[PDB]
Amino acid sequence: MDFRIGQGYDVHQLVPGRPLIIGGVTIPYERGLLGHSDADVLLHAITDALFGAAALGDIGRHFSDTDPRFKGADSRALLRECASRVAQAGFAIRNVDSTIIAQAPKLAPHIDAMRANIAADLDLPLDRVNVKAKTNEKLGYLGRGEGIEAQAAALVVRE
Amino acid sequence: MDFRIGQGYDVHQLVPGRPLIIGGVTIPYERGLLGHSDADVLLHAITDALFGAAALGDIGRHFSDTDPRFKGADSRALLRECASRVAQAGFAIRNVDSTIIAQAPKLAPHIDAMRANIAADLDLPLDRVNVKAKTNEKLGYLGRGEGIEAQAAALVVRE
Amino acid sequence: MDFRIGQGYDVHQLVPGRPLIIGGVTIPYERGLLGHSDADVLLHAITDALFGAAALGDIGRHFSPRFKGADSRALLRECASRVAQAGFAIRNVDSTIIAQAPKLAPHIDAMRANIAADLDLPLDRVNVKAKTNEKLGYLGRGEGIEAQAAALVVRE
Numbered sequence: 001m002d003f004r005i006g007q008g009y010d011v012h013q014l015v016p017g018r019p020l021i022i023g024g025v026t027i028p029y030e031r032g033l034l035g036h037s038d039a040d041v042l043l044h045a046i047t048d049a050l051f052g053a054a055a056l057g058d059i060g061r062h063f064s065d066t067d068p069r070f071k072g073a074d075s076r077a078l079l080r081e082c083a084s085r086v087a088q089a090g091f092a093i094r095n096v097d098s099t100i101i102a103q104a105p106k107l108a109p110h111i112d113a114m115r116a117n118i119a120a121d122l123d124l125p126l127d128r129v130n131v132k133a134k135t136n137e138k139l140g141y142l143g144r145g146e147g148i149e150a151q152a153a154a155l156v157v158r159e
Numbered sequence: 160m161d162f163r164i165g166q167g168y169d170v171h172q173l174v175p176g177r178p179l180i181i182g183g184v185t186i187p188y189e190r191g192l193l194g195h196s197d198a199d200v201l202l203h204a205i206t207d208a209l210f211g212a213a214a215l216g217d218i219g220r221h222f223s224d225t226d227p228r229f230k231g232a233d234s235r236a237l238l239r240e241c242a243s244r245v246a247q248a249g250f251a252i253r254n255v256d257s258t259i260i261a262q263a264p265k266l267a268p269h270i271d272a273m274r275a276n277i278a279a280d281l282d283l284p285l286d287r288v289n290v291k292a293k294t295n296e297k298l299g300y301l302g303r304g305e306g307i308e309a310q311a312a313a314l315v316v317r318e
Numbered sequence: 319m320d321f322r323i324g325q326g327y328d329v330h331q332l333v334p335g336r337p338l339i340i341g342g343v344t345i346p347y348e349r350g351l352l353g354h355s356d357a358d359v360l361l362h363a364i365t366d367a368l369f370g371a372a373a374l375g376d377i378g379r380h381f382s383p384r385f386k387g388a389d390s391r392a393l394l395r396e397c398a399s400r401v402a403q404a405g406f407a408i409r410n411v412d413s414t415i416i417a418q419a420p421k422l423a424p425h426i427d428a429m430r431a432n433i434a435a436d437l438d439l440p441l442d443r444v445n446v447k448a449k450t451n452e453k454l455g456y457l458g459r460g461e462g463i464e465a466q467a468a469a470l471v472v473r474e
């Protein structure tokens with residue numbers, strides 16, 4: 001059994017005038033994450049952890065701005081494509097764990113919807129997908145609500 | 160061979176008039192970590208990694224940060240209950256690794272005592288538990304002594 | 319079947335005068351990482367992940383002596399030796415570099431090769447990823463550069 005681990009990181013600024021989308025879930029809130037597309041910090045971190053575990057580089061190498069098929073794709077579509085490319089390299093996904101660091105808003109009521117989005121997109125049972133939520137105890141830009149961070153870890157195995 | 164990985168993150172402010180308890184070790188210092196519990200940043204991150212690997216949510220959902228029973232709570236007891244919930248869910252713990260980021264004080268002399276506490280609490284041999292120490296090179300709120308961070312990784316197996 | 323996971327972290331200040339060395343690769347830039355050796359943030363993070371996985375402490379505990387003055391690729395090979403000595407084989411390494419500037423993409427494959435050579439691993443078991451910090455905090459301002467690592471080992 002040829003197991004591999006991957007880890008992922010993402011951060012985006014938290015600004016008025018964009019929706020707040022994390023884990024494929026749109027969360028009603030006065031601000032949203034700034035970046036390309038939906039700036040879904042959680043799905044990007046997971047996407048990188050999966051590419052990382054398959055040793056397939058990173059999210060930036062896979063999906064560019066000029067990409068004719070993936071310009072106009074949201075972060076769930078990128079995740080589904082990532083899962084396909086991980087399978088192409090010979091790996092089946094075993095589990096995902098993650099942490100969202102956000103001072104606000106409260107994320108607890110939206111976690112299980114995030115897990116269901118991720119589980120569906122990866123064709124995993126719900127109980128192989130975990131998402132945890134943290135504040136930053138008012139420390140740094142995260143503590144001041146200037147951005148939201150996601151951290152992810154993934155376990156795969158070669159078929 | 161049903162292996163799972165979890166990862167954990169925690170940070171707490173460093174303030175005067177608090178005990179400095181990391182990995183269950185009371186460390187002499189002019190300041191201590193601030194929280195609802197004893198604010199043991201390391202144990203909390205490990206606890207989160209273990210809940211994450213078993214896909215049981217997070218430390219927030221299991222133990223409320225606004226509940227008199229948990230005020231000043233011994234984080235080793237929270238870690239021991241976590242281990243119990245991980246077992247009941249059908250997993251055995253294989254290893255824990257972790258990092259504490261603190262600019263001060265020196266943590267190296269206390270590392271082995273931390274490992275001893277964690278190993279006892281998780282009923283693990285010492286050689287499956289690791290704790291590492293880092294400063295933040297005087298960068299950010301961590302580099303300025305305003306808080307302490309912990310990171311953790313945990314490998315479990317469904318048994 | 320006795321698998322173990324390890325995780326690593328490192329950060330270093332970005333300063334004028336110093337060469338920028340990440341993953342053993344000298345990258346043209348007006349600033350470089352401040353530290354004892356070449357202050358190779360990436361290699362230190364991977365080194366820590368490896369000691370962590372084998373439960374052998376950390377980089378600072380191993381190289382607190384002779385290893386004062388060593389470059390990070392030397393420390394990494396030595397780390398691998400001590401990990402092998404302890405009875406563990408390395409299965410894979412993954413890592414992320416967080417740097418606002420410069421562009422790291424053109425240098426990633428070369429870092430990969432350096433790490434794989436140093437760990438005596440095939441290229442397809444070593445991975446390096448690049449991130450910016452979206453202009454946030456000391457990382458976003460180019461005050462420093464961070465690396466994260468994760469490692470899987472098996473006790474032989």
Ligand SMILES: Nc1ccn([C@@H]2O[C@@H](COP(=O)(O)O)[C@@H](O)[C@H]2O)c(=O)n1
Pocket residue numbers: 058059060061416417418419420421422423424447448449450451452
């Ligand atoms: N310093 C950096 C940071 C990111 N990159 C590349 O571009 C990145 C995309 O930038 P962000 O994802 O940080 O917005 C990474 O995915 C990586 O492929 C780089 O080449 N050098």
Ligand SMILES: [Mg+2]
Pocket residue numbers: none
């Ligand atoms: Mg950080």
Ligand SMILES: [Zn+2]
Pocket residue numbers: 010011012035039040041044
């Ligand atoms: Zn992103």
Ligand SMILES: [Zn+2]
Pocket residue numbers: 169170171194198199200203
């Ligand atoms: Zn805590």
Ligand SMILES: [Zn+2]
Pocket residue numbers: 328329330353357358359362
């Ligand atoms: Zn270093």
